[model samples]
Target: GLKRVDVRLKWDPSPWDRPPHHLDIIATTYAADAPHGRPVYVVQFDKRSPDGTINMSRHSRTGQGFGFVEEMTFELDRLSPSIARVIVGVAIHQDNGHKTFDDVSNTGVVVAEGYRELLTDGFERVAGATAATVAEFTRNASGAWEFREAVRGFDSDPVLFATEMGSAPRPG
Candidate 1:
């Protein structure tokens, strides 16, 4: 049996004086046993998973619309046998300057699988960092999915972040 997970991120609208800040939500899947083999899949604004299993509903530049959101349907039942870990992350676009979570208010991410709340957290943990790993999903011995709460921070821009966000030491 498998489950569907919804990942949502929201932040307060940016002030007019500074360039609008954007929060980009992303998910990366890896081979549990052989993590060094490269990621199984990556979901973000540019890729969006060609298979259509994971995707970003839309992009919010000013955090004024529906709020930045991304959804993933974890087909544990159909996932590749080699697949193992999935990491969810959020990055603040550094267009204007080096902005951190402290510069943005009311920022938070919620992870839910159906009615079950797997994890939820505000940006307070990584308030001084620009990017963060919010959650990690792994397959247990019984093939059931498990969730781990992670709020590790990084001091890099979104582009530089994508390369190292999935690994430890996370570009900080």
Candidate 2:
């Protein structure tokens, strides 16, 4: 029997002063009782964020990136009745290229307690799940930029989507 659960995602744009220029959100769900690595739904939103930025996948590093200040709510139809997980990422498009930075920039993350942190530098973990609560783009605030997501997933087995990127992380 699958259990019914409520899922929601949120991001506040007021504090950063500059929200994401666009947002590329993907929602993938797996059946808790599935064989091993099969997901029920692998949905993706390749559109611009609410702000209307073109390159939807390029909003992280820009600082002026795009995000959600409000809450996005939905209900699972028939989950495997075990644990459900949700992964929402923010696409901040830098000025130059997409998802790459030429300078040092501060990345931020938001969690349940509204806790925020600044990530000086690192590589993009576009698979499985990020180590933090959210993902942020990076760049020099000028030339070729970078995009990143500080956020990952909850329980629906984020690793499922990692294979799609060909660089999935292994959990020990």
Cα-based lDDT for every prediction: 0.76, 0.30
Clashes of each: 0, 30
**CA lDDT of 72 in candidate 2?**
24
lDDT tens per residue, model 1, 12-39 = 8777776787888877778877553456
Q: How many backbone collisions does model 1 have?
A: 0
Residue 110 shift from truth in candidate 1, angstroms: 0.6
lDDT of 2 by residue, 33-92 (tens): 431344344443432222121112222222343342222222322223341343333333
